[PDB]
Design a protein around this ligand. Structure first.
Ligand SMILES: CC(=O)C[C@@H](c1ccccc1)c1c(O)c2ccccc2oc1=O
Ligand SMILES: CCCCCCCCCCCCCC(=O)O
Ligand SMILES: CCCCCCCCCCCCCC(=O)O
Ligand SMILES: CCCCCCCCCCCCCC(=O)O
Ligand SMILES: CCCCCCCCCCCCCC(=O)O
Ligand SMILES: CCCCCCCCCCCCCC(=O)O
Ligand SMILES: CCCCCCCCCCCCCC(=O)O
Length: 582
């Protein structure tokens, strides 16, 4: 149509429009106060209503980039507050927008947002539901310039729902705090996954991305023809390149088109897309990205037909290596929604290496006749880790399971920071309590998903403050070897134990008054330090020292005079404990 703004306003709605415009400005003008953004939002919203009334009104024919760019350049404190960024306003539109992305600071030095008390939140919520949520939408959007805006809006609505419900509860906190903790983690995970997929697309390149996409979409849409999946992998690749670059508008349109495309060809892709394809513009793509795997045809041939036996596998492969490998992935993935994507990538990798070191042999058909026997050990490695770890988690509880990981990883990389080990082991523990509750068929995809963020974050923290070559080795390995690399780490025979420190192992009644979370972290911290001090201790030896500790705590956190107890019974525990640990 003639007016881009009018169009977006129409099929978006005033409410969503105002929220998005807000998120958009907060993502570029990250240093401006809330009240300034609110003002801009009103001016842009007013402008929009105008174009809705008269498609031909002034400026209404200008593109969103142009309009958005002009408003941005309106801010008078631009040069003083943003310096260099102000120089962007001197360029012709095509480059002006390009210039703004380059200055969108991915990580500003804003204060960590603190969670106020439930009572204060709920009261603010009730006094002014809108400015309360917009204020935070603003605080979140400015701290996360790259988070896809629409999704950030999607989260805002879940936050609103949690307040509406919880602030009306007998006991507010019991209802809200957890919903909020769940919202945060999920938000951080969605965030980490977007940065991950973008880093990946940057480091490893387009081929690795498409490979990942083929495998993932084939498990998701096992009934779609391979030509259809290829189509989608192509569009998804363009979509993410554009979304990673940070240009919100281009990004949103490509996603919109794709969502539209999928829905129109819905019956030719999956049966579980009805719901999603009904939903409103703003949610189609998000819904689709998260849709459940469709059901795979029960009448499916044996892979070995076209991939192992069939003479002339090389003829088809040499004719177009990637396509052939792609079909292999497609065929293999849609039959295995229970495999993790990386495992599927590992198989395809293995197969590629084999076709390369076989198609250039006397009797090819016999060189690669095995192949499928190559996969068995690749498939089993991840499955065994899942059963073995989920069983342990079943016996012990999340907490005790975290302590087990704690001991296990401190011994593998003692060089790592204690607080880093504690966090990593804790998040690793959550992955266990989250995924082990699923039936085997969904366990691996689940672990992969959560483990990818956890490992990524682990690596990032290590990128900054390097400590182990082995960690760096794993972290810089190919995406397909990342987790197997970490699983392959063994006890550090090198490590020289930190000599004893009286402080580190001293305790006061503070732990009696502290809440579970802080108490566990206090205990878990001591544990890492314990292992670092005597890394040659046994599950058995440590287990004894740990038990004598559980008691020691109880004994003192209950005794009339707690203070003394922790000092006298403290001297003892430590003295005795050292004796036992030689
Ligand atoms: C996040 C996902 O697992 C699904 C995702 C995707 C990303 C890269 C390669 C394959 C699959 C995904 C989307 O981003 C998406 C965007 C717009 C429309 C449909 C989409 O579907 C997806 O599956
Ligand atoms: C996600 C955008 C919607 C804005 C609503 C957020 C309101 C919750 C405020 C708490 C934020 C502090 C983060 C946390 O620790 O949970
Ligand atoms: C002046 C510019 C303000 C316009 C705001 C950008 C509009 C975003 C459209 C989002 C549509 C959802 C697309 C999707 O992800 O499926
Ligand atoms: C058109 C289909 C494109 C898919 C290409 C198949 C590539 C499979 C090889 C496995 C990739 C492992 C990732 C990597 O090491 O880069
Ligand atoms: C399952 C949670 C417990 C923590 C142990 C994780 C073990 C799962 C490893 C398998 C990861 C699948 C990804 C891959 O194929 O490398
Ligand atoms: C802080 C550095 C410690 C890093 C600990 C390594 C994390 C291991 C992740 C792999 C989980 C699968 C279980 C395993 O094979 O050990
Ligand atoms: C070298 C002697 C110092 C003694 C070390 C004791 C510290 C053990 C902390 C482990 C916490 C037990 C875990 C728990 O059940 O909460």
């Amino acid at each position: 149509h003639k007016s881009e703004v009018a169009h977006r306003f129409k099929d978006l709605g005033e409410e969503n429009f105002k929220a998005l415009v807000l998120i958009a400005f907060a993502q570029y003008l990250q240093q401006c106060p809330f009240e300034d953004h609110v003002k801009l939002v009103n001016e842009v919203t007013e402008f929009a209503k105008t174009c809705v009334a008269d498609e031909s009104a002034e400026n209404c024919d200008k593109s969103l980039h142009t309009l958005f760019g002009d408003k941005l350049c309106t801010v008078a404190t631009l040069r003083e507050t943003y310096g260099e960024m102000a120089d962007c306003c001197a360029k012709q539109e095509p480059e002006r927008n390009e210039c703004f992305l380059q200055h969108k600071d991915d990580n500003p030095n804003l204060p960590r947002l603190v969670r106020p008390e439930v009572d204060v939140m709920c009261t603010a919520f009730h006094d002014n539901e809108e400015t309360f949520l917009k204020k935070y939408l603003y605080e979140i959007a400015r701290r996360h310039p790259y988070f896809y805006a629409p999704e950030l809006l999607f989260f805002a609505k879940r936050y609103k729902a949690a307040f509406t419900e919880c602030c009306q509860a007998a006991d507010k906190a019991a209802c809200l705090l957890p919903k909020l903790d769940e919202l945060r983690d999920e938000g951080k995970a969605s965030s980490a996954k977007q940065r991950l997929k973008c880093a990946s697309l940057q480091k490893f390149g387009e081929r690795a991305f498409k490979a990942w996409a083929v495998a993932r979409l084939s498990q998701r849409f096992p009934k779609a023809e391979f030509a259809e999946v290829s189509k989608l992998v192509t569009d998804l690749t363009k979509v993410h390149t554009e979304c990673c670059h940070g240009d919100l508008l281009e990004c949103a349109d490509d996603r919109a088109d794709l969502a539209k495309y999928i829905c129109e060809n819905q019956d030719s892709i999956s049966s579980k897309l009805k719901e999603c394809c009904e939903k409103p513009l703003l949610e189609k793509s998000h819904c689709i990205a998260e849709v459940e795997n469709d059901e795979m045809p029960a009448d499916l041939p044996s892979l070995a037909a076209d991939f192992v036996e069939s003479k002339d596998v090389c003829k088809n492969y040499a004719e177009a290596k990637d396509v052939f490998l792609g079909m292999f992935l497609y065929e293999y993935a849609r039959r295995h929604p229970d495999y993790s994507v990386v495992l599927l990538l590992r198989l395809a990798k293995t197969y590629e290496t084999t076709l390369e070191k076989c198609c250039a042999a006397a009797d090819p058909h016999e060189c690669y006749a095995k192949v499928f026997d190559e996969f068995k050990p690749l498939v089993e490695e991840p499955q065994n880790l899942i059963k073995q770890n989920c069983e342990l988690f079943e016996q012990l509880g999340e907490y005790k399971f975290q302590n087990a990981l704690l001991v296990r990883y401190t011994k593998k990389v003692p060089q790592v920071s204690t607080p880093t080990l504690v966090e990593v082991s804790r998040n690793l523990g959550k992955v266990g309590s989250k995924c082990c509750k699923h039936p085997e068929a969904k366990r691996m995809p689940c672990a992969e998903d959560y483990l990818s963020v956890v490992l990524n974050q682990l690596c990032v923290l290590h990128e900054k403050t390097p400590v182990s070559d082995r960690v760096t080795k794993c972290c810089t390995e190919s995406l397909v070897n990342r987790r197997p690399c970490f699983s392959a780490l063994e006890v550090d025979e090198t490590y020289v134990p930190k000599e004893f420190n009286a402080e580190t192992f001293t305790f006061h009644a503070d732990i009696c008054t502290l809440s579970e979370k802080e108490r566990q972290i206090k205990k878990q911290t001591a544990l890492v330090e314990l292992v670092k001090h005597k890394p040659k201790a046994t599950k058995e030896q440590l287990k004894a020292v740990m038990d004598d500790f559980a008691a020691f705590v109880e004994k003192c956190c209950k005794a009339d005079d707690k203070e003394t107890c922790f000092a006298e019974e403290g001297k003892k525990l430590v003295a005795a404990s050292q004796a036992a640990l030689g």
